[PDB]
Design a protein around this ligand. Structure first.
Ligand SMILES: Cc1cc2nc3c(=O)[nH]c(=O)nc-3n(C[C@H](O)[C@H](O)[C@H](O)COP(=O)(O)O)c2cc1C
Lengths: 369, 371
């Protein structure tokens, strides 16, 4: 009889409950460096009582950023800036802190969403040359990426390794390899983006080959006891693209290769995607991945209500509920869920006076004697 | 026909709406210095879409702190530490940032709430000698404060002035002088704490004299264009103390002396109690101070729902509503209120995608595109 507020575990990392704060790009870094925005944002996310925080898509190289203001972990300055933020978080919260390591591939060199998200060309001041499995653009008329060669692919492997080591040194507790949302690894997985005719394209085994090498490299580099997993897009929502069968096959391989979990999202590789959006619309993909592969499975997508979240766990549809927008709109979401479902959470002492009367057990360890 | 989400103004300071974030002690400073907590906390508060943020009780001297971990503005280090927090706020928020300047008087040298809130004796670790209008402890068996002399009262005036100048140099946009919660100024106001026989105790005029000296000194020191006001307790719960008549007389004096507002605490009557009595105002004392004195009247609102706050404004009970606990339990309270009331709010661009599926146009001037 599983419940949202059961303690849980991914690999050896104990989680206070099944609630994860999904990775959410803030587009507020400067040359990859965390800024005051990140102390405010991650600081507040850490007070939420969620069991797990997944830091935003963190670029393994400058050219792997989505946008010029993405968070990075590709040099010592980036490491020190993020370390300042993490020190503050650890000072005020017991949350498990993990990080999503990322490379945008052909979707790199973009504007922030509030600036319309368009491609910035390599010839424009903030733009740069992008890389992908094949020299085909994400959308028609865009400046195409260069097709990766052997040394290019090695650089990416080595950059993921280097970033995973910096993350380890910072005391980060886990790594989510970004394999979703139309970014570099997903580009290799999907026949929409991957037109290669070497051993990294064509067949399913070939298309999975580089994403799995990247996974393996990170898993080797990161301390063995701390979990490493992948976020996947379960489908492209485009006929003949990546689909749930590819996802299941990849998930089996991830399990065989020591992944701690699979975080199941969808979409991102094609402007043609025909997404059927609605509450819990991506839960069926997580349910199937959980059923067939049996790794800890995180579900996400328009999960906004405590009873909805609880129902997903109760129905064995996922093991972890990932929440993004509902956390931005209510950074106390897990407190509020705990109040509705008769549970407790960790909260900073500064805010112990804050809950309504009648919820005297809501905050673990709270006292005033 | 006023509404919660109408723009408003205090002095020259334009406010996006009638929602103020109440000064809420965090007990998280080190020798008066703001810490990483204040960055995280004040950063959230500043991004809430409220019109006005009032920084917590900020000690004018170490001896004037409520606790050993109160926020202070009494030396250069205090100033620099707060400046770091404010600079982050300014990078990200359009909110008006103001500060409550404070001195705890006989209630100083106490523990934080999670440590039981007790007095720390002058001879214990972290403790210190407290000061007050008279040598009478807040509670029996506590170490009494020293009764202030002419020099001690001058130090306090000058400390308020010094802190007000530091606040101005930090670019803080307004000052709330703390005359409530049984702290130093309230101790002078109240015959319960003030047993002085000189020109500072006895009659109502004598009891208001030092609080009004402090207010005047702050108003003189702080840039004339920026608002300065006082926080006042509507009434004591006990007889022969401070009362609603005193509050009204003090609010008239504040107006004549160039106060921008008055911020009226509840006098111990919550909305749950108040709405059952008489006309059923939620903030009856604030309502009366507004009607009789005509200053911009901020009322402490012990409320959680948008509809409660709207009604306070729409029923002419207050011009600005300050919100404390509901802001801690929901730092997006003004977003949630705006959604209920059909209004919009300033939200940081980083969070514009958070708008629920139901809603549209919640966030002012939001735009989105993605490849
Ligand atoms: C502002 C914002 C930033 C995001 N950044 C990332 C990211 O860095 N990495 C990622 O895998 N997904 C990212 N996503 C997708 C979310 O993690 C999540 O999967 C998606 O928003 C659906 O969940 P929700 O309905 O709970 O918001 C982001 C979403 C938003 C709204």
């Amino acid at each position: 009889m599983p419940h949202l507020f059961d303690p849980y575990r991914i690999g050896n990392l104990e989680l206070a409950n099944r609630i994860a704060i999904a990775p959410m790009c803030q587009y507020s870094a400067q040359e990859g460096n965390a800024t005051d925005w990140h102390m405010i944002h991650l600081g507040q996310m850490a007070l939420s009582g969620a069991g797990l925080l997944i830091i935003e898509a963190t670029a393994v190289s400058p050219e792997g950023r989505i946008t010029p203001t993405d968070l990075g972990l590709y040099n010592d300055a980036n490491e020190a800036a993020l370390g300042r933020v993490l020190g503050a978080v650890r000072n005020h919260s017991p949350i498990a802190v993990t990080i999503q390591l990322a490379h945008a591939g052909r979707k790199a060199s973009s504007e922030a969403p509030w600036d319309g998200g368009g491609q910035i060309r390599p010839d424009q001041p903030r733009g740069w040359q992008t890389f992908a499995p094949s020299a085909v653009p994400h959308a028609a008329g865009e400046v195409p990426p260069a097709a990766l060669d052997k040394a290019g692919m090695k650089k990416i492997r080595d950059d993921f390794v280097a970033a995973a080591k910096r993350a380890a040194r910072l005391g980060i507790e886990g790594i989510e390899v970004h394999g979703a949302h139309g970014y570099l690894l997903h580009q290799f997985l999907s026949p929409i983006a991957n037109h290669r005719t070497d051993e990294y394209g064509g067949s399913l085994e070939n298309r999975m080959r580089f994403p799995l090498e990247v996974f393996d490299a990170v898993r080797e580099a990161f301390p063995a006891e701390r979990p490493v997993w992948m976020r996947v897009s379960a489908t492209d929502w485009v006929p003949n693209g990546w689909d749930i069968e590819g996802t299941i096959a990849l998930s089996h391989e991830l399990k065989a290769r020591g992944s701690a979990a699979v975080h199941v999202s969808t979409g991102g590789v094609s402007p043609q995607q025909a997404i059927k959006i609605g509450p819990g619309y991506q839960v069926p993909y997580a349910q199937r991945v959980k059923a067939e592969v049996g790794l800890p499975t995180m579900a996400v997508g328009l999960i906004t209500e405590a009873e909805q979240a609880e129902a997903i766990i109760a129905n064995n549809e996922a093991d972890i509920i990932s929440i993004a927008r509902a956390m931005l709109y209510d950074p106390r979401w897990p407190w509020h869920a705990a109040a509705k479902l008769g549970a407790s959470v960790n909260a900073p002492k500064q805010y112990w006076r804050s809950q309504p009367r009648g919820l005297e057990k809501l905050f673990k360890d709270a006292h005033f004697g």
